Amino acid sequence: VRYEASLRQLEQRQLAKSVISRVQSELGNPKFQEKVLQQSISEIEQLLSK
């Protein structure tokens, strides 16, 4: 059970570092541009609701 719990913790932190690799992928892509448009219009809609 002890190695099982350790392995679960280890898997999540390993997969966390794989997420860091995905973060670097997102901020490179012109998904960075297209999601900025989405965020921009979302802020327009949201802030207009204020």
Binding site: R8, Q12, L15, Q46, L47, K50
Partner: protein, 499 residues
């Protein structure tokens, strides 16, 4: 897997970040960010940085609002956006923290699930009024026989456990908590004291041992451990007893009784010293801030037994003060002694001489005292106080040809001193405290050889348990010692004395 659940939770945040008032750090040095913005901020309000740091806002100055960071300065840098959370500090309160070691914020440092407790209520609130209280009369029994007899403790009161550093000050305290398991098992919710141990400045390894010991004795399920460890920041340490008190309020308000052990306010003091100095407020007497009296007093009058219209409840407290050289003359001890209603002063020499409990009987007083004493135990230990008084004078008579009376006192007294030894981490039941002391009172134990006192004690208890646990249960449940019971006890003791 579990990762998927977290990602779903992240998808579940997307909230409009229209921060009505933001701030920008102008300069951050020493964990004292000076922020430009925060126009309508409430004092002591919780602020969230870009660094994610949490803070309180002790200084609201006109040009800058001087946040005191709870967080580390490591990520903090100038210009950092300072979102105004807009909520003064609050912590979950409720029975959700039973068997939960939590930090001040409420994060479970033991990670025994995210704390789900009844409500989150603010850290500081002012102490109960005159009429919102009714006088103490309900005992609380710590299992430590000497404590229960020499300085009997009650409910919703303060009374110190002031003693020398690392004499297992925490051990003396922990013993009380352990005995509360017996009463906790008991149905009445005044008998259910939901203890709160406030581990202040205590290294995480030490508290881990504490937790482990508590787990061994299965005490984590009435125990709550508010933890501000050695690493935990001076704001957290500062607000830690206040935060803890609020948890206690839910129980108190619910009319239940509970015991909060602030250990040690001396380390709380240092944190305030650090804070005051960092805000460059002049440090009071003994370089401990001037409003330390005010700080401690604000906390310590929250320990109170409420009135019966306020649903007869309490938050009993037992502050622990660390006496650096044993100086109760030291500024923080003197202040605290004045504030509180009783003190118990453990004696280092006694500790060294292996007398554990190491209590200095003279320098221990309880003002509530015998009002909150079991009647049975009161009867059979009024005598004990007087005997010990003589024994103290006849202590110096241990340097010999002595008056027969004096020599008798010396014998009786020595046997008593050994009787009041109670090996650390083993509480005793009240129904078994009372017979033993009665024997000593009747001088039955005087005859028994000192070495054979120990053998006598455990044996006597089993002998009593076999011979008449009818008597023991009767004594326990009546809670009084009737002439018939004391008669039977004298006889029973004689029978045991014969063996």
């Amino acid at each position: 897997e579990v990762s998927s659940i977290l990602e779903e939770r992240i998808k579940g945040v997307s909230d409009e970040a229209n921060l009505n008032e933001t701030g920008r750090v102008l300069a951050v040095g020493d964990g004292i960010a000076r922020v430009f913005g925060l126009n309508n901020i409430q004092a002591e309000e919780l602020v969230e940085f870009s660094s994610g740091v949490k803070g309180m806002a002790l200084n609201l100055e006109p040009g800058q609002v001087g946040i005191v960071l709870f967080g580390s300065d490591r990520l903090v840098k100038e210009g950092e956006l300072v979102k105004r959370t807009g909520n003064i500090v609050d912590v979950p309160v409720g029975p959700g923290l039973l068997g939960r070691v939590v930090d001040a914020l409420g994060n479970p440092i033991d990670g025994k699930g995210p704390i789900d407790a009844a409500g989150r209520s603010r850290a500081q609130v002012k102490a109960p009024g005159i009429l919102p209280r009714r006088s103490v009369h309900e005992p609380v029994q710590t299992g430590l026989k000497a404590v229960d007899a020499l300085v009997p403790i009650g409910r919703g009161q303060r009374e110190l456990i002031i003693g020398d550093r690392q004499t297992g000050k925490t051990a003396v305290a922990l013993d009380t908590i352990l005995n509360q398991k017996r009463w906790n098992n008991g149905s009445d919710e005044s008998k259910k004291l939901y203890c709160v141990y406030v581990a202040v400045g205590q290294k995480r390894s030490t508290v881990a041992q504490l937790v482990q010991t508590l787990e061994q004795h299965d005490a984590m399920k009435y125990s709550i451990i508010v933890a501000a460890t050695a690493s935990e920041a001076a704001p957290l340490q500062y607000l830690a007893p206040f935060t803890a008190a609020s948890i206690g309020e839910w129980f108190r308000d619910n009319g239940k009784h509970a015991l909060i052990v602030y250990d040690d306010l001396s380390k709380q003091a240092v944190a305030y010293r650090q804070l005051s100095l960092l805000l460059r407020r002049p440090p009071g007497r003994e370089a401990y801030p001037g409003d330390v009296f005010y700080l401690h007093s604000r906390l310590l009058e929250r320990a109170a037994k409420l009135s019966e219209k306020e649903g007869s409840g309490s938050l009993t407290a037992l502050p622990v003060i660390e006496t650096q050289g044993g100086d109760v003359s030291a500024y923080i001890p003197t202040n605290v002694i004045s504030i509180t209603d009783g003190q118990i002063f453990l004696e280092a020499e006694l500790f060294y001489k292996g007398i554990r409990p190491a209590i200095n009987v003279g320098l221990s007083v309880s003002r509530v005292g015998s009002a909150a004493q079991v009647k049975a135990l009161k009867q059979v230990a009024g005598s004990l106080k007087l005997f010990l008084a003589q024994y103290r004078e006849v202590a110096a008579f241990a340097q010999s040809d002595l008056d027969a009376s004096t020599k008798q006192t010396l014998v009786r007294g020595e046997r008593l001193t050994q009787l009041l030894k109670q090996n650390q981490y083993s509480p005793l039941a009240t129904e078994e405290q009372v017979p033993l002391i009665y024997a000593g009172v009747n001088g039955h134990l005087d005859g028994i050889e000192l070495s054979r006192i120990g053998e006598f004690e455990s044996s006597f208890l089993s002998y009593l348990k076999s011979n008449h646990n009818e008597l023991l249960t009767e004594i326990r449940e009546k809670g009084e010692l009737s002439k018939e019971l004391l008669a039977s006890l004298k006889s029973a003791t004689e029978s045991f004395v014969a063996t």
